[PDB]
Design an enzyme around this catalytic site. Structure first.
Site, PDB file in Angstrom:
ATOM      1  N   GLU A 104     -23.628  40.255 -19.332  1.00 21.06           N
ATOM      2  CA  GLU A 104     -23.837  41.305 -20.339  1.00 21.06           C
ATOM      3  C   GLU A 104     -25.294  41.316 -20.739  1.00 21.06           C
ATOM      4  OE1 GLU A 104     -21.606  41.172 -23.955  1.00 21.06           O
ATOM      5  OE2 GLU A 104     -19.654  40.895 -22.954  1.00 21.06           O
TER       6      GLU A 104
ATOM      7  N   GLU B 256     -16.597  35.412 -24.655  1.00 13.58           N
ATOM      8  CA  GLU B 256     -17.292  34.777 -25.778  1.00 13.58           C
ATOM      9  C   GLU B 256     -16.403  33.912 -26.684  1.00 13.58           C
ATOM     10  OE1 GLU B 256     -19.787  37.806 -27.620  1.00 13.58           O
ATOM     11  OE2 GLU B 256     -20.942  37.996 -25.747  1.00 13.58           O
TER      12      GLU B 256
END
Length: 351
Positions: free
Chosen positions: A293, A162
């Site tokens: 995820e 991220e």
């Protein structure tokens, strides 16, 4: 070893769907190097066994994170080696040997930008300073990659979790690859509006190129927080194309082999770009897309089984749920449910 043939993951002569989860760590940022792997192995190994027994074939787990313990840095922020105590290389090999025992492909994730905890600005220096980055590459990354070169249980290297946690959103740039105006009010930058895209793309390009120079058969990815940073559809801008990475860093092989989206509902609702309300082809990309995820508590009302099935049934290349250590009781149900599906790749593997 895992590869991509005709646009799809293939292992041992068969199209494979990557099904499993994110460990995501045992002791956060304290799992590898400086003797830490052997200390944590008795807790990590059972997670591989449980995952395998449930029918998973894939584990993502996090390595350096923000440089808490590896790689080793000097006081000026240059990297001196993979660690200090000289266990890191052995640790990474043993991780992979352990995974092989359980027929699990491993996806180590090197760095993290989802929090802003970078003690001594160690990660910050690698992103901003080319000389510091080169020291990481030469003193730590290449030695690690070389040591485990060709390992059959290595699925691929995830350079960073991220990046968008610390990217400055709503920033004009004349160069499309660097412009973040499409990310205005997306939530990007939550951990602090810190970085510009030319710096992060160089960071990614140089590491990807180093990996594939050292182990040319390795695969490389990076996990985006939301596909909003990773598609030219949906009124968005794909920052992570081959063109953008090469533009920023100049290194020809510093590109991703596959993309990796994270997807979570917010306040119970999927956003307008969510992988869980779309299909892989909607993103206009030309690499496999792993949904790397997700979890039920932010699953928009879906059960975890519905989520694993959704990913499998909508053209994606893999599904990794979030936090097996805490949430594996539930998540294993979804992994088990899809384990025998074959229409979008077979799941059982033999290493």
């Amino acid at each position: 070893r895992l590869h991509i043939q005709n646009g799809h993951f293939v292992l041992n002569g068969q199209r494979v769907f990557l099904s499993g989860g994110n460990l995501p760590w045992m002791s956060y940022a304290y799992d590898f190097g400086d003797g830490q792997w052997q200390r944590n192995k008795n807790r990590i190994e059972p997670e591989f066994k449980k995952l395998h027994d449930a029918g998973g074939n894939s584990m993502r787990l996090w390595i350096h994170i923000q440089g808490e313990t590896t790689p080793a840095f000097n006081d000026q922020g240059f990297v001196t080696g993979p660690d200090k105590q000289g266990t890191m290389l052995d640790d990474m090999k043993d991780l992979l040997d352990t995974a092989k025992k359980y027929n699990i492909l491993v996806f180590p994730c090197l760095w993290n930008a989802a929090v802003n905890q970078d003690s001594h600005n160690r990660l910050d220096g690698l992103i901003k300073d080319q000389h510091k980055l080169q020291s990481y590459i030469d003193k730590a990354l290449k030695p690690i990659v070389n040591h485990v070169k060709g390992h059959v249980a290595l699925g691929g290297w995830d350079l960073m979790n991220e990046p968008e946690g610390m990217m400055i959103p709503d920033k004009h740039n004349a160069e499309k690859c660097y412009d973040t105006t499409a990310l205005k009010n997306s939530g990007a930058g939550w951990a602090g509006n810190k970085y510009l895209y030319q710096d992060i793309l160089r960071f990614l390009n140089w590491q990807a190129d180093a990996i594939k120079t050292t182990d040319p058969g390795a695969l490389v990815t990076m996990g985006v927080w939301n596909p909003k940073s990773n598609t030219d559809h949906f009124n968005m801008n794909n920052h992570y194309s081959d063109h953008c990475l090469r533009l920023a860093g100049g290194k020809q092989k510093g590109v991703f082999d596959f993309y990796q989206f994270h997807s979570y509902s917010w306040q119970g609702k999927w956003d307008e770009v969510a992988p869980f309300t779309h299909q892989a082809s909607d993103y206009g990309l030309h690499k496999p897309i792993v949904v790397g995820e997700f979890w039920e508590q932010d699953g928009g009302g879906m059960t975890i089984t519905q989520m694993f099935n959704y990913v499998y049934n909508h053209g994606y290349a893999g599904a990794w749920s979030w936090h097996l250590v805490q949430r594996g009781d539930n998540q294993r149900k979804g992994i088990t449910n899809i384990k025998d599906k074959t229409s979008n790749g077979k799941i059982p593997i033999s290493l």
